[PDB]
Symmetry: D2
Subunit: 124 residues, 4 copies
């Protein structure tokens, strides 16, 4: 596939999905790349975005929940890696849901292609 | 002007910026629309996105930090407002920042136009 | 498989890729959904975006070329399907390329899930 | 103000709006940065996106027509400016429009901040 699923040893790209809460009709999911072992974030090499998808049990189709773009990577008029602003690739999606189902996240590294992570959403 | 800046009495559109955390050279900034008086989120009327901008003091130009798209609004093959999935218009942007500066957020209601909120990041 | 690849009879979802120009590696690629048999575009049911990916031959990784979001679906303060403005799901991606390779397009319908189309770029 | 409107001399940033076609109730609008004098497109410096907004005359609010992201700027595992792939900052937006009205375009250079362009759609 275009969508890579297994991280290499020394650099992490697979978007990791953490269900922070799922009860009372409401869900909070954090998705990150390189949470424990940071991926580079330079003008030349960085994670550009994460998109989260959710398919409720019994829904014939999945739904895009949302997308987070990480847009600052240090560039400035003074050269690459000079602005002191770098957006970390971690996003929090809050959404209503009524059933459990499957979470899929996609992410993109500007030089290492496309990536997919997956997790079950158990709604209390 | 195109970017509206003062809420109306009954429905809330101005994006609200909150610094949640600033430690270790990383800032976490929450942006939300309607945290207190919730904006509608239906198939026909919803907040589509929030974009955050940061201009460090002394920087000649502002930088986009990132953009969050809130993509689920209830639509399904069964009709509007039936999928049970609605993305809340709240995002958290985690970024490296070296200096105090000005935070500006833009947001969009699909029927009520474009909006802007502003806040100050003070690092000392 | 989240990415559907085969259209239904009555409603068209697969992003169709047309290379308009590939000369001197100045490349224009049009991508559309429902070009000949239009997909609905209402407040309730529409194509929300198309994304184009290109992997040059010899490149170990693919690159996102760009993404086009189609944001207007007739919503207004007067009700659904009243603004008079609807964005058609067609985009043109202009880019430079040095080698031939593989194009992949992705698109999304707010109710019928995710879709993929593929084509070859021959410079 | 954040949205700059007047180009410098050496380098063009203002997005230029052109109505290419208007028939059958559908309008095609091209928006580009640097069509005469091209803006740089390097791993370090590039136009990242253009967004188009349309407000039909008599409509109390504007509508975002759509957004185009130009995501490739030469980065590869071989270093900056080595992939062979660069996305030109030109987009075409095709949309149904019933009425004349005002077109606004926004664009972003990753080191030179935010930009605005304006034009009139005349349908008679
Ligand atoms: Fe990487
Ligand atoms: Fe509203
Ligand atoms: Fe559909
Ligand atoms: Fe520039």
């Amino acid at each position: 596939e275009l969508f890579q699923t297994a991280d290499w040893k020394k650099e992490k790209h697979v978007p990791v999905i953490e269900v922070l809460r799922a009860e009372g009709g409401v869900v909070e999911v954090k998705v990150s790349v390189g949470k424990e072992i940071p991926h580079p974030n330079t003008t030349e090499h960085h994670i550009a975005w994460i998109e989260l998808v959710f398919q409720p049990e019994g829904s014939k189709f999945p739904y895009v929940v949302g997308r987070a773009e990480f847009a600052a990577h240090g560039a400035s008029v003074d050269g690459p890696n000079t602005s002191g602003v770098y957006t970390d690739p971690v996003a929090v999606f809050a959404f209503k849901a009524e059933k459990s189902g499957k979470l899929t996240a996609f992410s993109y590294c500007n030089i290492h292609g496309l990536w997919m992570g997956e997790a079950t959403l158990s709604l209390e």
